[PDB]
Design a protein around this ligand. Sequence first.
Ligand SMILES: N=C(N)Nc1ccc(C[C@H](NC(=O)CSc2ccc(Cl)cc2)C(=O)NCCOCCOCC(N)=O)cc1
Lengths: 11, 27, 251
Amino acid sequence: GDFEEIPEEYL
Amino acid sequence: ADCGLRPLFEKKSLEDKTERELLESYI
Amino acid sequence: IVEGSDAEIGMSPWQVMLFRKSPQELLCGASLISDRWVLTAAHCLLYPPWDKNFTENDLLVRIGKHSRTRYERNIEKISMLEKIYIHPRYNWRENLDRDIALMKLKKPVAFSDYIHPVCLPDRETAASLLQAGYKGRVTGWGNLKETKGQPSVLQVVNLPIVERPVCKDSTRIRITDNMFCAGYKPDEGKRGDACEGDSGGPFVMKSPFNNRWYQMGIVSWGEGCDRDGKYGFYTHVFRLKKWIQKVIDQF
Ligand SMILES: N=C(N)Nc1ccc(C[C@H](NC(=O)CSc2ccc(Cl)cc2)C(=O)NCCOCCOCC(N)=O)cc1
């Protein structure tokens, strides 16, 4: 949870 | 080509805060 | 990066973050050398002793970043990997000799104020700049100390190249011509070094001849971080440029 979620287009 | 020339620095003739340190070491 | 400072916006536009998909975490640094090729350390992708052997689908490359943990909307670009190429003679069994790898992106990344490739040295630029005393620059989102902890944004530090005999006498590891070391000596006062998470990132120098930035090394290995009498070791990029050219020409 350290990094902000990345859009799912990449996850 | 245009490699190694930074848009926000070399391209606009602006220097970053510590690149001078590198230049001064190249004696 | 230990004893460094916050990078300025767009200061290292070739900086790349190697990001693990699951769990989402920072693996290593890397650099952009063209719109579709990224350079990093082989050990970031392959290291059998620690059961490390990543495949293309396990990773992502984040380009144009400044903040370490935040998703920089409208600024950073995230790219998928098409293929990984590790030097065929990368010595993971012993001393990490020829610690270099290339990653081809699935699609070309768009250049911007925050995304731009670094140059690879020619024989002359390498011969002129790779001298003891001459300083290079290392950047990364690695730890701030060997033991604050993690940086909010990209860190930067300038370090002097060290004489080969001093590099060799500072460690028990066998040093090869494909490596060079950098950092301040105890009596020089100043400090600084790469640390965990910075591996794979670039060691760059600004040519005083044409005012262009060249990547002379790749953060490879070190024993601890910023320890007195110890120095960081970097992959000698020019010495392995023929391999780089061969891969790019063929693929
Ligand atoms: N709690 C922890 N995370 N502990 C931990 C984590 C990593 C190591 C490996 C060791 N690196 C370090 O000690 C600091 S990182 C570092 C990396 C590069 C440079 Cl130029 C300077 C410092 C290093 O560089 N060793 C060199 C030889 O072995 C390398 C290990 O094989 C795989 C690999 N990633 O290096 C040691 C202990």
